[PDB]
Amino acid sequence: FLTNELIRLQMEKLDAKLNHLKKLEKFMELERKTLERQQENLLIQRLNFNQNSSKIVNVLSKCLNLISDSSQIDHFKSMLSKP
Amino acid sequence: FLTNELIRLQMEKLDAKLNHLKKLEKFMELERKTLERQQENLLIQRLNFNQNSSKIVNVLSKCLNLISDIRSQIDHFKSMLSKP
Amino acid sequence: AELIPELYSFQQLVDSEKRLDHFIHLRNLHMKRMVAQWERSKLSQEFLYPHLNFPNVKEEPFMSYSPQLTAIIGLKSGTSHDAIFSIYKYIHLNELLTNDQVSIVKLDTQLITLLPSSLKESSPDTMKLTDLLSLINSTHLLPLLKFNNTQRESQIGAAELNENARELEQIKPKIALQDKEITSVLSNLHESNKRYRFFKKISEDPVKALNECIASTSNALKVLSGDEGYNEDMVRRANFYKENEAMLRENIEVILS
Amino acid sequence: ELGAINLHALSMSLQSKNLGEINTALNTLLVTSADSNLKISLVKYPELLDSLAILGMNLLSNLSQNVVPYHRNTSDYYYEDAGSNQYYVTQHDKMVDKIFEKVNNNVKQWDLLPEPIRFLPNQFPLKIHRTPYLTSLKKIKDEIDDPFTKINTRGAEDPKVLINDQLSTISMILRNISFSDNNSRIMSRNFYLKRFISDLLWLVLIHPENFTCNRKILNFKKDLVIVLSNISHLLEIASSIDCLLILILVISFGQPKESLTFNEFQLQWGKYQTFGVDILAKLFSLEKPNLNYFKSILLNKNHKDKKLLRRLLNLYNHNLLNDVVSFLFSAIPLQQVLSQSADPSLLIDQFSPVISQSLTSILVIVQLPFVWLSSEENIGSGLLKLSEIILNINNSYSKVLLPSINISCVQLIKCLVEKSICFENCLNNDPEILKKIASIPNLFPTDLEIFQLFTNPSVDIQIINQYQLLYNLKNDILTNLE
């Protein structure tokens, strides 16, 4: 009886081991590539919004001048409705 | 007693395999959760900022309408300056 | 069925390591669900990859927009797909839609100024956004090295997914062989169990065990052949003084007989 | 086979003697088996069903009482005489007899037809028999050949097996009768049949040992759940006990091993685990303020009956209906989403929707001291991928697809929000829950998918709203997280 059970254990060991190899290789690969994609997306959208905000501030300066001759989006719209 | 040696070794291997299993499991899981949270974070970030772009666009459109009495941005700005 | 993968219910659980290899099998099922959902996870992560066109930071596809467009999104170039998703969300946020088809959206100068030449001004509509998609896919998208980058995109994860599937299939048949061995050793375990049960029962008090096994063997002999209701009761006294349904059944008989 | 014409065998069956019972029962069983042209119509049938249930009740009763019928030394078991009477006596003159009696020397209650069902003194509830389909191998081990099979594969050399197989055959023929219109004849009005079902249940699960072959127990469970499948109307008279019984019956299947307690069934062996949820939907749709309400009391954690009920719940040890949830979560996934195509799905798909229906229905019944959450690295939810599958199918059986995907989405949102608000009301857990909720790969269809969806099919308006509100709650959770 106990002999046979030990054999079963050996089989389960084989199973688990092969599964472990699968796990390690596959999933480390997937997580690495996903992390890379994520960080790319992150930094690219960061700089995107940077360009945006800069443009917005420029427009702010312009419309400020124009209204005077008649975030800060708060004060912008404030002066806007004021005029 | 060689038998008992074998038995203890089987037990220990069982424990070690279980521990390795569950550790690697939770490890993958938490990595996945991290990646996810950060992914949806990036998503909503993009959403909000496109919203802001469109918002200030509508704002400057209102302003252009007020003038009654990016390329198009600076264009309308120069037009308003000329009108002034 | 359930027999095929296992039989472990109770065996007296002598040296009860059966719980432990049980747990092992359980965690195998755990890993099975794990790998399954992982394949699905990689599928899903892929899903977006063929449909994204944002990467610009590290022929050239970013086509410039129209003055109307740079008035709309404030962005100058890129792909039509990004612009159309943008205006999609624009309709969503301004909620100019209508839901009685739904693609009918209440037109606005913020939009109709995209096509003012056809005297769309004659009719600010609530019309199919699809009509606009058809309109703004070439009407305002116009113009006025890094080839290697086309490599590093969606295809990557697809290929590695294929590799993983291939190596999983590679390992599968070994697993099948191990399962065959499992079935074998299980059946052997089962027989040996039967034998042990038999033998210990003999150990108990061989008189009764012998009598019973003998009678059962005889009964098996008979049932594997023609069957007779009673081997005995030529000893009339017993089954007739100690039984009376004979009377009633008889009564039933004689009425017809 | 052949011969075997008449229906009125009921008469002989109604008779109380072993002989007639055998003669009929066996025959009529063989009859109802045959279906090539053989069916049991309904004209003045009902008497059949009555007789049947009466027989089963009495037999199972005195079995539980461990006493053989059909053979005593009493007979024609009441008065026998030809006394002083022509037609009308026992008036005033009867007292003269007393006078006569006092000088020569020089009212009742009647029981009802069947016996009581529960409260039976010997039968007192002790937890046994809450074991899964595993027992099949037990069955094997039981049916295994061995010098001590004790499977008298022959007739009744002792009456115990006789009663056993009697009840077995009765159950079988009852099953076979139950495959047509005339389900209405069986429809919850053969109060006899229902009494039979009840007490039979109360035995098979609370079974002090009188049943020989475990395989008989399997047969009973099996054809019982089948005949249940052919009911789609009221049940549960003296309900509570019966309701818990039926729940344990359906829970019989599926492999057990907090978290989900049930390994999803690898769908290539069984077909009864089907019938289980089939009934737990059909015989549970009646929102009449009884059945639903009985299970609602089963949320909790003559009059002696009530004592019984809790008596079993603590004798099933927190909560328990989570087990029902886990059970419901079987047979759907992990095989069709792991196949090579979506066409072989459609078959078991036909089967699928009633399950989700049952689930969301019971989630109307959970809106008090608990700890419940059921998305914890236990299932995830391929429901999204499944929905995508059926969607791609749509734009590439029938009549069930759209409702299935719709209710899948509704299920998702409702379970999400109910979990959240529940552990809000308790507030026994950190806001990490949100983060926890925000940490599912199987969740929240990507907004790009929403967008591209919003265009192509244009034939899924309601479904579009489903996904719409879903994404809405998603974005809400994202925002208010911070």
Swiss-Prot record, chain B:
Compartment list: Nucleus
Domain of life (superkingdom): Eukaryota
Ranges for region Leucine-zipper: 14-42
Known partners and oligomeric status: Interacts with RTT102, SWP82 and the N-terminus of SNF2. Component of the SWI/SNF global transcription activator complex. The 1.14 MDa SWI/SNF complex is composed of 11 different subunits: one copy each of SWI1, SNF2/SWI2, SNF5, SNF12/SWP73, ARP7/SWP61, ARP9/SWP59; two copies each of SWI3, SNF6, SNF11, SWP82; and three copies of TAF14/SWP29.
Function: Involved in transcriptional activation. Component of the SWI/SNF complex, an ATP-dependent chromatin-remodeling complex, which is required for the positive and negative regulation of gene expression of a large number of genes. It changes chromatin structure by altering DNA-histone contacts within a nucleosome, leading eventually to a change in nucleosome position, thus facilitating or repressing binding of gene-specific transcription factors.
Other known facts: Present with 3150 molecules/cell in log phase SD medium.
Protein name, as recorded: SWI/SNF complex subunit SWI3
Species: Saccharomyces cerevisiae (strain ATCC 204508 / S288c) (Baker's yeast)
Organism classification: Eukaryota, Fungi, Dikarya, Ascomycota, Saccharomycotina
Gene responsible for this protein: SWI3
Range covered out of full length: 681 to 777 of 825
UniProtKB/Swiss-Prot annotation, chain C:
UniProt entry tagged with the keyword Transcription: yes
Gene coding for it: SNF12
Tree of life domain: Eukaryota
Name of protein: Transcription regulatory protein SNF12
This protein's GO CC annotations: chromatin; cytosol; nucleus; SWI/SNF complex
Record's subunit section: Interacts with SWP82. Component of the SWI/SNF global transcription activator complex. The 1.14 MDa SWI/SNF complex is composed of 11 different subunits: one copy each of SWI1, SNF2/SWI2, SNF5, SNF12/SWP73, ARP7/SWP61, ARP9/SWP59; two copies each of SWI3, SNF6, SNF11, SWP82; and three copies of TAF14/SWP29.
UniProt source species: Saccharomyces cerevisiae (strain ATCC 204508 / S288c)
InterPro entries listed in its UniProt record: SWIB_MDM2_dom_sf
Molecular functions (GO terms): structural constituent of chromatin
Family, as annotated: To yeast RSC6.
Subcellular location: Nucleus
From Swiss-Prot, chain D:
Subcellular locations according to the entry: Nucleus
ZnF (C4-type) residues: 409-426
Transmembrane segments: none
Family: Belongs to the SWI1 family.
Function: Involved in transcriptional activation. Component of the SWI/SNF complex, an ATP-dependent chromatin remodeling complex, which is required for the positive and negative regulation of gene expression of a large number of genes. It changes chromatin structure by altering DNA-histone contacts within a nucleosome, leading eventually to a change in nucleosome position, thus facilitating or repressing binding of gene-specific transcription factors.
Subunit structure: Component of the SWI/SNF global transcription activator complex. The 1.14 MDa SWI/SNF complex is composed of 11 different subunits: one copy each of SWI1, SNF2/SWI2, SNF5, SNF12/SWP73, ARP7/SWP61, ARP9/SWP59; two copies each of SWI3, SNF6, SNF11, SWP82; and three copies of TAF14/SWP29.
Record remark on domains: The prion domain (PrD) is a Gln/Asn (Q/N)-rich domain, which is unstructured in its native, soluble form, and which forms a parallel in-register beta-sheet in its amyloid form. The first 37 residues of this domain are sufficient for aggregation, propagation, and transmission of the [SWI+] prion.
Additional information: [SWI+] is the prion form of SWI1. [SWI+] is the result of a conformational change of the cellular SWI1 protein that becomes self-propagating and infectious. This conformational change generates a form of SWI1 that assembles into amyloid fibrils. [SWI+]-aggregates sequester soluble SWI1, resulting in reduced growth on carbon sources other than glucose, reminiscent of a partial loss of function of the SWI/SNF chromatin-remodeling complex. [SWI+] can be cured by GdnHCl and by deletion of the molecular chaperone HSP104, which is required for [SWI+] propagation.
Recorded name of the encoding gene: SWI1
